[PDB]
Amino acid sequence: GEELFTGVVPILVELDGDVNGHRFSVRGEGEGDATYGMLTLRFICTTGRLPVPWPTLVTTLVQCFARYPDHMRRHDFFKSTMPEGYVQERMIYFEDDGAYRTRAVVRFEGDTLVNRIELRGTDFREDGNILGHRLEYNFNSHMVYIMADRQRNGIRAMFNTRHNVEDGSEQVAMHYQQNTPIGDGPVLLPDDHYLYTMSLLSVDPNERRDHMVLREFVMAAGI
Amino acid sequence: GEELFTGVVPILVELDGDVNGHRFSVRGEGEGDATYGMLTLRFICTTGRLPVPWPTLVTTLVQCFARYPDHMRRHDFFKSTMPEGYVQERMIYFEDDGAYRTRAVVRFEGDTLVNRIELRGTDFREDGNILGHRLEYNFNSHMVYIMADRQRNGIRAMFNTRHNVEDGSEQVAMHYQQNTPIGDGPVLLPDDHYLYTMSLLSVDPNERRDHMVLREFVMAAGI
Amino acid sequence: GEELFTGVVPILVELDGDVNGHRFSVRGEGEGDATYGMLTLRFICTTGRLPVPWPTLVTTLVQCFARYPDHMRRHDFFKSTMPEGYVQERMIYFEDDGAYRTRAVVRFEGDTLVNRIELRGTDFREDGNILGHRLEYNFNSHMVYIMADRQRNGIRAMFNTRHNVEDGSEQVAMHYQQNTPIGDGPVLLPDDHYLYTMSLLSVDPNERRDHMVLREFVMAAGI
Amino acid sequence: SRGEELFTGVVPILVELDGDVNGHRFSVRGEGEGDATYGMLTLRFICTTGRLPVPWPTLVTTLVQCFARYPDHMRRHDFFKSTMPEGYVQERMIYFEDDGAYRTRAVVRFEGDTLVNRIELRGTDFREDGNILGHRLEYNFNSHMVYIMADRQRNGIRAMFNTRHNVEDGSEQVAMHYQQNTPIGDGPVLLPDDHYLYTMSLLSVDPNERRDHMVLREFVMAAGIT
Ligand code: NA
Ligand code: NA
Ligand code: NA
Ligand code: NA
Ligand code: NA
Ligand code: NA
Ligand code: NA
Ligand code: NA
């Protein structure tokens, strides 16, 4: 379960999205090194240009790559589902704007950890910070609070992200998350704890496609 | 006691307010899911327009809905009072402005958890950020520090909130709180600990009344 | 020792100051309620007008009033010295500006906890934020890191404060502190831990003297 | 005097950096002292080649985590002192938001009674009119958290952290640090459980030093084990 993550694992991400009727797709590829909580991914919009800012898609675009320290190993739900994996669902409410609803399957396809997602965004403002593209290309560090959900044999999580806006304000997104295993194998249901995240977004100056390069470090703490 | 909160519980909130002589009332309705620390409430001003910003009323408008993790269950004062409930009193000092004094009864009325409040505000500046309505419609995340009060058979709490102002500054409100059980049944007096809060305020575009929609997630930590 | 702080204790503060040759004095009076980490003080400049902002004097103007939770009672150095008390010395380095050197005696005189201080400030800029009075009248929350000093039979502490400047920046003050008992009685030398502080400054609209009203809540944590 | 014992008093420090950023070569020398018992350092740095081509704040993290205060209960988790006096190699990659990267390699060890940090730094792909080569970073420093992880294969540690650099327009520019430390000797070392270092720093100027220079005071403590 854990054993599938002891080395460098290749990652594939596919997203099909529709926000206020604007349809788009994203494909990402890279690799994860869970032993040290690290991911590097590169994403392209395969349908032309994204109709929303990249930073709004970061949280939707594999918490099985978090570093769980030794003493918290029995609290790593995400890896304990693998290889059959899990369904991750969220509702994401943007301050003063619309909402994303997402559903994703996270599992191994051969040697690759794959995250396949559907996203639906509704009630955004056409001249808001999202559809108006006024969010800075960067990302803050966040804390994801994880709770067992014994009835679903999985977890829930709750967290706010803070997105910098070009006028120097921050726009919050409140995330409600639930994860459910796909297989019937046993899983590790955790005591409450958090994941601390740090991310850096960057650009490849020679990629003419709409794109995002992402590096991330995630670790678990609080037991 | 705890058993009253194991599912979704309907909530009713009623506030009678007077700030610098301006009288108003608010009614709120929604539901709470203490198992995962969640609340959703919708509030209306039933007297016309509020004389103060909505964000100034959030803290006054049911800490019995906080998620206490399993190991901290013996520290959940709030639920241990139920159904007879508790009196919550606060003094709230606004930076460079007036103060709110509040008193509230929190208890079950039938299957509904009801928070009934009186609020009195004094010495506000007529052209300050409060009576001048210069506070942003949003809310930050906060830490509420909880202490047992053995003499009162209850608790005290202390915390600052930070309210964003439209000129990009923050205005602090310093909260002094005390809670006292209404019944004589035994209660759980806690070791020191905190509640971490996260909130999102929103608007219903079709509600013409002065109103606030609130979603909140609260969890206990620090033992 | 602890027993001296079980109720409300009156406080007296006296400061003699000289900053770049500008001499001034301050007297404060109020009371502290260490059981709940609280204090309220009112300070006046007894020599006319202060030559530096009030916020620069807050840290120098009784950590014996911090709330130590039950499990941390053996780590409360400050109360363990009482009534004979302690000498508190600091060096305070202001970002891009001068420094304060302070020495204070903190001890009971009769039933009153008295803080008597000498402050010497050097190398301030005449048109900096301090001597130019460009610091906002407010205060942030801070973390004071406490370490035993076995050779001195006391403690050291280190912390930065952050002072809001009227142009929207923050100016840091780095504090180096040391406390030494006055008596030869035994004291409690603590394990490393912190004090978390929260403060609110206010003004009495009918006090014509240069003055500061201060409310503060301080608690110990981290064992 | 081995490991921890070498740090019980005040230890003199020497720092030497050879740098090249987008082809601009420079050197820095620092001297001062560290008092690990209370997590404190005071250092003064000069650019010995004229003027620095990048802001001083971009060099602070590269310019001796052996001076951190490890509290008593965390003593078995102090990798850095356990290597001494033979010391360690510290390597980093530092990625600046919207700009280039630094790669650094440093040897940290005792030379006689002095703890010496000798560094090579190479910066690439910076923008000529960015905040770094354009000198638009404020002369100050924030407080940070450095997350430390054992690396059992290398007999050492890794660390990960973001710094946040204030920019003159009131924004912050993040630098993401990837770090690895490897002992130089073959003696045994202390491999830690996960934990963090909390940092606080103050930069200042000596009004009578005409050279390009930085005075730095810092306090670092370890935390996060039961
Ligand atoms: Na988001
Ligand atoms: Na996102
Ligand atoms: Na408030
Ligand atoms: Na409020
Ligand atoms: Na200060
Ligand atoms: Na101060
Ligand atoms: Na840096
Ligand atoms: Na740096």
Short mmCIF file of N, CA and C and ligand atoms in Angstrom, two decimals, chain A residues 54-60 92 94 139 161 163 175, ligand 2:
data_model
loop_
_atom_site.label_atom_id
_atom_site.label_comp_id
_atom_site.label_asym_id
_atom_site.label_seq_id
_atom_site.Cartn_x
_atom_site.Cartn_y
_atom_site.Cartn_z
N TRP A 54 -4.99 29.56 -13.51
CA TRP A 54 -4.38 28.35 -13.00
C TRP A 54 -4.40 28.13 -11.51
N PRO A 55 -4.20 29.20 -10.70
CA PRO A 55 -4.17 28.97 -9.31
C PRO A 55 -5.50 28.43 -8.75
N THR A 56 -6.62 28.65 -9.44
CA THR A 56 -7.89 28.13 -9.00
C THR A 56 -8.01 26.65 -9.15
N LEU A 57 -7.12 26.03 -9.95
CA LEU A 57 -7.15 24.60 -10.24
C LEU A 57 -6.15 23.82 -9.47
N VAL A 58 -5.22 24.46 -8.76
CA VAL A 58 -4.14 23.74 -8.06
C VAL A 58 -4.64 22.64 -7.13
N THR A 59 -5.58 23.02 -6.29
CA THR A 59 -6.02 22.01 -5.24
C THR A 59 -6.74 20.83 -5.89
N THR A 60 -7.38 21.04 -7.01
CA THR A 60 -8.11 19.97 -7.72
C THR A 60 -7.11 19.07 -8.47
N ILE A 92 -15.99 23.63 -3.57
CA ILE A 92 -15.10 24.75 -3.37
C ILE A 92 -15.82 26.03 -3.58
N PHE A 94 -15.81 30.01 -3.61
CA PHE A 94 -14.97 31.19 -3.80
C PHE A 94 -15.62 32.39 -3.21
N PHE A 139 0.98 30.98 -5.21
CA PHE A 139 0.23 30.16 -4.30
C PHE A 139 0.74 30.30 -2.88
N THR A 161 -8.25 28.04 1.17
CA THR A 161 -7.06 28.55 0.52
C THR A 161 -7.19 30.05 0.42
N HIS A 163 -6.02 33.11 -2.12
CA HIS A 163 -5.48 33.43 -3.45
C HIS A 163 -5.15 34.88 -3.55
N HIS A 175 -12.89 24.95 1.02
CA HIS A 175 -12.96 23.60 0.49
C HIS A 175 -13.58 22.63 1.47
NA NA E 2 -6.52 25.89 -6.04
#
